[PDB]
């Protein structure tokens, strides 16, 4: 191919933007802002995803999701990420953490809890926690140690 040969196929040459140019482009004079007042003016309106015109907004609902934390902030506790048997029905090695995340299922700072639905491959599954239900399902095919080391 040449350069006088290139070009983008349809929908991507949409590059055509809008306007406040002539009459019978539409979009002229009042520039699609209508005759109007506040919204037509330069600054625009208050944040319209939030402002309700002076009456109390829907900030009339209430905080229940209590304990928003106190000044020192978040407490560093452990956190466990779920995986499903189905997802780990992929490979057929010894299935461990680190090995799991190094594949796209965990996220670095999360302790491994296998669980959930799927068919239990006959395999050893090194895990930090198991669901009552997935512990049983896979106990009918393979081994499943629990963790905790320094």
């Amino acid at each position: 191919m040449k350069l006088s040969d290139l070009r983008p196929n349809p929908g991507a040459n949409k590059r055509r933007k809008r306007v406040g140019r002539g009459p019978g482009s539409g979009h002229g004079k009042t520039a699609t802002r209508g005759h109007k007042g506040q919204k037509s003016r330069s600054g625009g309106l208050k944040d319209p995803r939030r402002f309700e015109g002076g009456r109390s907004t829907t900030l009339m609902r209430l905080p229940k999701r209590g304990m928003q934390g106190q000044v020192p902030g978040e407490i560093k506790r452990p956190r466990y990420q779920g995986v499903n048997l189905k997802d780990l029905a992929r490979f057929e090695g010894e299935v461990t953490p680190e090995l799991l995340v190094r594949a796209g299922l965990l996220k670095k700072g999360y302790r491994l809890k296998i669980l959930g639905e799927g068919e239990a491959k006959p395999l050893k599954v090194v895990a930090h926690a198991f669901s009552k239900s997935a512990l049983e399902k896979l106990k009918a095919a393979g081994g499943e140690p629990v963790l905790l080391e320094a």
Partner: protein
């Protein structure tokens, strides 16, 4: 620059897996002197309607 999460909203509303917005019910605070037991028990959670789309717009980044 980056948009900011409206903390007034994050503290009192929730986005469901489907994308609904759930909050509690107004009215169980405060004046229960003798609202009927039906009344005060009737206050669990509800779903706001088309107008929680506005909320969802103020929790861009929270996601799910």
């Amino acid at each position: 620059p980056k948009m900011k999460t409206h903390k007034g909203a994050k503290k009192r509303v929730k986005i469901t897996a489907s994308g609904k917005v759930v909050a509690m019910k107004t009215g169980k605070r405060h004046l229960n002197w003798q609202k009927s037991g039906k009344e005060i028990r009737q206050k669990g959670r509800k779903f706001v309607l088309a107008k929680p789309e506005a909320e969802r717009i103020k929790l861009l980044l929270p996601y799910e």
